[PDB]
Amino acid sequence: VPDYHEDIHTYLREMEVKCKPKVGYMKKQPDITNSMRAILVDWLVEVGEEYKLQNETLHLAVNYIDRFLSSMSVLRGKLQLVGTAAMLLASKFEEIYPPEVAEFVYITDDTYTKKQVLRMEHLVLKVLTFDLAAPTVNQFLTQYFLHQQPANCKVESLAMFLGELSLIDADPYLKYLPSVIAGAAFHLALYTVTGQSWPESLIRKTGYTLESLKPCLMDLHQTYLKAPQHAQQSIREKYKNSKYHGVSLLNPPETLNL
Amino acid sequence: SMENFQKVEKIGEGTYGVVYKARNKLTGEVVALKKIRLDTETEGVPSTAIREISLLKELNHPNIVKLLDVIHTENKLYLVFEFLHQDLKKFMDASALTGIPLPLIKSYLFQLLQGLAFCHSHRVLHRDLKPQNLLINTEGAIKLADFGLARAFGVPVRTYTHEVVTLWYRAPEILLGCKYYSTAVDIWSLGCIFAEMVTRRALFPGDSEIDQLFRIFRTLGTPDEVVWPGVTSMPDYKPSFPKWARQDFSKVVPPLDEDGRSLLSQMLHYDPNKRISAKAALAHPFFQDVTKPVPHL
């Protein structure tokens, strides 16, 4: 229903700037670290597989965790707790059948009580002032997916996997806006699988070119190369399923030709 | 806390929680209070309240009710809203001796399509237009209300909940189980609502899904592959459907002119890709002379 496509792309681009998190927040986190955030996002992928949640949901959940920690200081035994609450909220916002609070409590191997979950949820709702409709990489990808010639389902799937790896690592991905990670990721997918590049029509819609995307593209490219040694691997595991055409099994390009 | 409001009378129960008319003791504003009973060690803040609150604060428009504030307790959550005089259903039923003049119909249709384009435009689907959710003021304004069933949507959309829209105002894509639905469903409800502002009676008052379908098909014809490519392959499409002929639109809504019939007819296109979008409907020849008369009150 490309009736509102330029209208929605245009609004999404304005809200990624307002829904974006502080790039330097981990320097001001007295007790948690990128790696500690890397472990939590991994866990969340896994919870995602476990209840069969949308990938969009894992992506909003992350957006909430980053914006919550952008201004709330958190001890490392509480980081999961922020992570379960953001995850109930994202589920409560996007899923047809949200997992129930029991299930959030159960998958923390009763690290937290139900009452604690439920007070953090509430507390995430006020740090975030109830603004849960953030734009995500996945919202930008799906719009970029409409531009393939013809649709290539390995391409979609590998873009999904890479945009998804961008979630795990706060350094370098918190410097980049969602539209831009999806850019890099859609380019990296098309190139690997088909040899083609960021098409002319997406330049026209997005205003992004290979020159705009390179900074993100170089980074995403080293992430693709090191994927197999990353301490975190649930994204790799997941992308082995049939459902995403086992694209975590494809070989990343040797070079990029930029 | 709720210190400054003076509760004045309840208004009713919509999709979730309860609504009261109130007054700001200090400023004098008349607000609509939507009181959501919290309940910890249950599920916590309902998703209906999380979608609405977050989507309504993005939607600020003359024809979308305005959510003025959110008083966030630990037991209760209150949504503070711009208050309105009545709903369309309640007005319609009051104007049923001498109906709604055309100018007021047009203007309301025009004003709803504006609010409805603004929602679609900001990736929001209302999913529950019906006269009870459309509030009117004493100035002629008409506004979309109750965002309890609304939803942020994606481009191309995904499958969303199926249990959606009040039966009578529900679209044929929904009744036959299409895995993907969109914005075309809000327009379909406005189509029914437009027809109702005119005839002063619901267009398709079914009593069940099958009843709904067959009432739609007795009016517009049983859809086929010609009028709607893909219909006969749909999940709840049945080969045995009675094959009904399409009644000529002037008999569907007798009082309407040619522009009005053309416009209602684009709103009710079976095929969701051909249904007119809200934006486009704003430039229909139906509205050349749209004005804003202030209804009787």
Ligand SMILES: c1ccc(Nc2nc(OCC3CCCCC3)c3[nH]cnc3n2)cc1
């Ligand atoms: C009659 C008298 C008064 C009203 N006023 C009014 N009501 C609301 O929710 C009313 C709900 C109540 C249950 C059915 C659907 C509509 C509002 N939300 C923001 N402003 C509102 N104003 C409306 C009708």
